[PDB]
Design a protein around this ligand. Structure first.
Ligand SMILES: NC(=O)c1ccc[n+]([C@@H]2O[C@H](COP(=O)([O-])OP(=O)(O)OC[C@H]3O[C@@H](n4cnc5c(N)ncnc54)[C@H](OP(=O)(O)O)[C@@H]3O)[C@@H](O)[C@H]2O)c1
Ligand SMILES: O=C(O)COc1cc(Cl)ccc1C(=O)NCc1ccc(Br)cc1F
Length: 316
């Protein structure tokens, strides 16, 4: 059972959540059930993962079996950037909500700040694989999502993969109704996001750390990529506490008051990943881990660098 980070809406976001990207059908259902049994209440989902219907089945089971109540679950999903045009925001959301079998979402995120060609081709690309842009912007999408909050279909809005420039663009938009409660970004010891975390916290925006384990299974992974789990310096700190490298990697975020969403479909690892509240990384250990910062992204999305609101060009 996790502690919480309080949002600006006063809602309580569990500090450890279950990731579901690449969780296969036929395993994600059992994964969600095992997580809930283990005390997970926060589940991180997305339209683009195309598995929300099976996550929904699992949540529903556990609710109808009285394992958990809905008010105690914290469900997050994301709007894919082929759906920034106003009517499409609603249709995509309704599909997400229907798949999850829920009456509301706790948080709804803009998945990426750059708009892609609108429609149900989720990855419009040219011959060379480069993303094809759409003219609708994240501010267009935001306007549409604010309706969902008005209607109570979504308790809070948030963003993902935003730089501080794009968050400023959002916060400084004349006539804003709702503020983002979180910015979900890649974060781990090779990409410590010190500047972006400092910025977000100063604006009352929490940070959710994705790929906390280095996303070691990701398709675009080349052999020369750094491995956090196998990192001797990470393993050293784990050994000190008789814990795993993964437990250290997760606890690292908890101690910066950053929400973290490790993905697994393996019951043993699902349980392991939330056994992070019976030990404490020392100030020196935290300092050591921070020093590992390489500004290395596992998720670069370079195929879209040519579009307007590419977030990773800026320093933070
Ligand atoms: N907003 C975005 O753009 C975005 C981008 C990426 C991810 N996310 C979210 O963040 C979540 C986490 O990121 P991620 O899935 O990219 O990678 P991650 O959580 O860093 O790593 C997941 C991988 O690590 C393995 N693993 C899990 N626990 C382990 C443990 N204790 N020991 C060893 N290996 C372990 C998993 O294997 P098994 O699953 O086979 O156990 C899986 O292959 C995603 O599922 C998704 O919900 C969001
Ligand atoms: O958000 C995540 O969890 C990781 O991101 C993805 C997830 C899924 Cl299920 C699928 C794809 C991505 C993902 O980010 N894929 C890379 C990619 C390639 C081409 C184009 Br036009 C866009 C694009 F984002």
């Amino acid at each position: 059972m996790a502690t919480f980070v309080e949002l600006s809406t006063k809602a309580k976001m569990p500090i450890v959540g279950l990731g579901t990207w690449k969780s296969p059908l036929g395993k994600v259902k059992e994964a969600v059930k095992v997580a809930i049994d283990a005390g997970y209440r926060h589940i991180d989902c997305a339209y683009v993962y195309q598995n929300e219907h099976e996550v929904g089945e699992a949540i529903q089971e556990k609710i109808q079996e009285k394992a958990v109540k809905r008010e105690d679950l914290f469900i997050v999903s994301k709007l894919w950037p082929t759906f920034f045009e106003r009517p499409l925001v609603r249709k995509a959301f309704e599909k997400t909500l229907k798949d999850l079998k829920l009456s509301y979402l706790d948080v709804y995120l803009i998945h990426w700040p750059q708009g892609f060609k609108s429609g149900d081709d989720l990855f419009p690309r040219d011959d060379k694989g480069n993303a094809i842009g759409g003219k609708a912007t994240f501010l267009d999408a935001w306007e549409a999502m604010e309706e969902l909050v008005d209607e109570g279909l979504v308790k809070a809005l948030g963003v993902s993969n935003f730089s501080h420039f794009q968050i400023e663009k959002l916060l400084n938009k004349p006539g804003l109704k709702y503020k983002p409660v979180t910015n979900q970004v890649e974060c781990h010891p090779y990409l410590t996001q010190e500047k972006l975390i400092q910025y977000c916290h100063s604006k009352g925006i929490t940070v959710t750390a994705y790929s906390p384990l280095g996303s070691p299974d990701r398709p675009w992974a080349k052999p020369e990529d750094p491995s956090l789990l196998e990192d001797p310096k990470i393993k050293e700190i784990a050994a000190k506490h008789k814990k795993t490298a993964a437990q250290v990697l997760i606890r690292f975020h908890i101690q910066r008051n950053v929400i973290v969403i490790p993905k697994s479909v393996t019951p043993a690892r699902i349980v392991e990943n939330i056994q992070v509240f019976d030990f404490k990384l020392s100030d020196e250990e935290m300092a050591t881990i921070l020093s590992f910062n390489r500004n290395w992204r596992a998720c670069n999305l370079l195929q879209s660098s040519h579009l307007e609101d590419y977030p990773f060009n800026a320093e933070y």
